[PDB]
Amino acid sequence: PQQINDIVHRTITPLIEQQKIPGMAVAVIYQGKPYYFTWGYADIAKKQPVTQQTLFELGSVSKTFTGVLGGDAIARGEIKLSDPTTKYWPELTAKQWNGITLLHLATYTAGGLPLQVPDEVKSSSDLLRFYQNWQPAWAPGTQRLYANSSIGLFGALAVKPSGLSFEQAMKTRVFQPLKLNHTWINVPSAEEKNYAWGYREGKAVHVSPGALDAEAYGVKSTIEDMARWVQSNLKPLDINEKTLQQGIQLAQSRYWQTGDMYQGLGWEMLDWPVNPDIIINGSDNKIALAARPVKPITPPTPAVRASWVHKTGATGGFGSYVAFIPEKELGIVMLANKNYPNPARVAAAWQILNALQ
Ligand SMILES: *C(=O)/C=C/N[C@@H](C(=O)O)[C@](C)(Cn1ccnn1)[SH](=O)=O
């Protein structure tokens, strides 16, 4: 009702002004049904406003789709996170890849894979040389270092038993079954009219191509489809497809623990209620991008409902954030065309959701 429109206005409006966000779209999920809000422009020079059909670069929020697609493949019996990486890429005959499993790739625990794939890596033979010549800093399953090269390789290998490409597998197994008809890995030409421009220090920019970009940060979506993406993760039991339903639960399963944070397949969870300063300060890159020791969780804790599930994402000129609480049936999406600091995103999201709790 009006309780939602009040808390969103008194929270996002100061956030937009303090961060000088050119355009923003927010979706609040309350008791299943979503509520949408828009501000600012999708194109500054053309003065095109932000609509419910405006495309935003999700950035690293794409990893949530990759983890769900990975869990879906686990439910189909095509892969196991315990399987060696070499089972799906035999040409990776390097000695350091002994014992590195798909779980180590998916949860950034392979031993120190770099944050980003190098810029010069473009062909599949370039990917091979990059992973063959990579030297780990720690043993498998000991240190967690957030890395696009880690989970990005997991997504490309998880779809090999299906025979489909990563783009086609994400379409026919995740996007289409959830009716995400406006979420694309590659934006079609007829949909570029809704493709908003990102802004990095005034200049309009889009995400540039890169190796394993679709698996790590290359997905774009609208505020309507992202809200439906939260409904699916809030209530996986409402999905008819069995493997996709189980894949969403496997993504929210707890495989590693660092402090009070649990690592899933793309998603990151903390027990609810949460100390807000932990998720706010923990979202800063000095903490989130740093290496941290992990403790295994065997067996992986099934999807705990009383949890705070969240994921930040950013590109050159975009800054997205998603957070939901399955027990309260509460969720929020924050899509902005500016890469403003992560702590401002989690602070505004917790204030909105705790008032609706
Ligand atoms: C997760 O949120 C990843 C974000 N990546 C962004 C960024 O850090 O802004 C990019 C994709 C970094 N990157 C990886 C490979 N090449 N660039 S953006 O800056 O290109």
Automatic annotation (TrEMBL):
Transmembrane segments: none annotated. It catalyses: a beta-lactam + H2O = a substituted beta-amino acid. It comes from Escherichia coli. Its EC number is 3.5.2.6. Pfam families: Beta-lactamase. Keywords: Antibiotic resistance, Hydrolase, Signal. GO terms for molecular function: beta-lactamase activity. GO terms for cellular component: outer membrane-bounded periplasmic space. GO terms for biological process: antibiotic catabolic process; response to antibiotic. This is Beta-lactamase. Coiled coil: none annotated.
